[PDB]
Symmetry: D2
């Protein structure tokens, strides 16, 4: 299947696994998703991190819900960093998932508990 192709652990050299960091003041959550924020992943017209989708899967919940989708659309100058910040309100607890795409290295995922 296609889900089989979704990786969640890097291989040395390149960095793909999305990093999910959040901040929460009551109901409003602040989420930062990124790829190669320290050890940058290549970013050129031929090889780059095209986009990152953010899902939220509430506890006692059947389906993950797509919160947002960000596209890094230029890879020369300007050079768009595969890094973004999303804003959403919710009163539920659950886990956040990040799905990222490298144009030549497929899909990648990660997660974090929204406490």
């Amino acid at each position: 299947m296609l889900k089989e192709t979704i990786r969640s652990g890097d291989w040395k050299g390149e960095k793909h696994v999305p990093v999910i960091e959040y901040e929460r003041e009551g109901d409003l959550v602040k989420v930062e998703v990124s790829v190669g924020k320290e050890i940058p992943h290549p970013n050129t017209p031929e090889h780059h991190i095209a986009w990152i989708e953010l899902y939220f899967h509430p506890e006692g919940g059947q389906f993950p819900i797509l919160v947002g989708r960000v596209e890094f659309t230029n890879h020369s100058d300007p050079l768009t960093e595969p890094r973004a910040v999303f804003f959403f309100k919710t009163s539920k607890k659950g886990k956040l998932y990040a799905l990222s795409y490298c144009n030549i290295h497929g899909l990648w995922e990660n997660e974090v508990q929204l406490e």
Copy 2:
């Protein structure tokens, strides 16, 4: 794992699994993807099929490649149909994958051999 939330089997009384139909003439490939072409899926502002992505995983290939992404953005009038046609050139043989999203029923997938 978000990967494990992806479904490939419908539950009685709602189509979600995307159907993939292709027509190849030489190096030219025409792909039609859709959800509930015969037995429609609900299409309202509260419930609908938001988008479908088409990946091509060539044989002797390590990663699936995203060919295209189409978004059905309105759900009143006009009512955007979760059905679309893509066009691409390739000389490789391989497997085609469709990833679709229902805003309340999550991610779904299917595949077809690109002979």
Copy 3:
């Protein structure tokens, strides 16, 4: 602003062509760029996407019907051409907005009879 950057012509065909067929309320729309004279399709230069809007008569604003992204430009080569399907009994104007990674925004329109 941004609207002023939106072109209608050529430079290399960039103008998105809109073609539709109607069967009652169902409109089948094909949008494309350089279907005769192909536009460059390479990682460095290509058509990235097209948005299809419908501005119904007796309606103040245009409504986004669908958006398509042509995401690979090597092999496979995603041709900047797509077909949408949407139901509507109304009549009006169809707008198509396409984007070239190095030549900006291009628009076009056709009457939906």
Copy 4:
């Protein structure tokens, strides 16, 4: 065509705000719609996306830096606000194009010093 449909008045806040921070070539850009005066945010009425363009002073075309979709409008409630990051040593103009599902396209601009 589409050009004429793009507003920048005030519908109820629709006009997308652009704010940025600069550290060398690295530009932190935050785009939003109605952070002061919240725009409706329901399945029927909401801001769906915002596109951020950069038009270099010595460039003839505006380049799409990034795009963001706010995909859920119940709970969670994706707020139409995002932060982008891009590198560029050049200066010029920044454009934001936001879309409301029932009020169309809106635009704004800010000089990138």
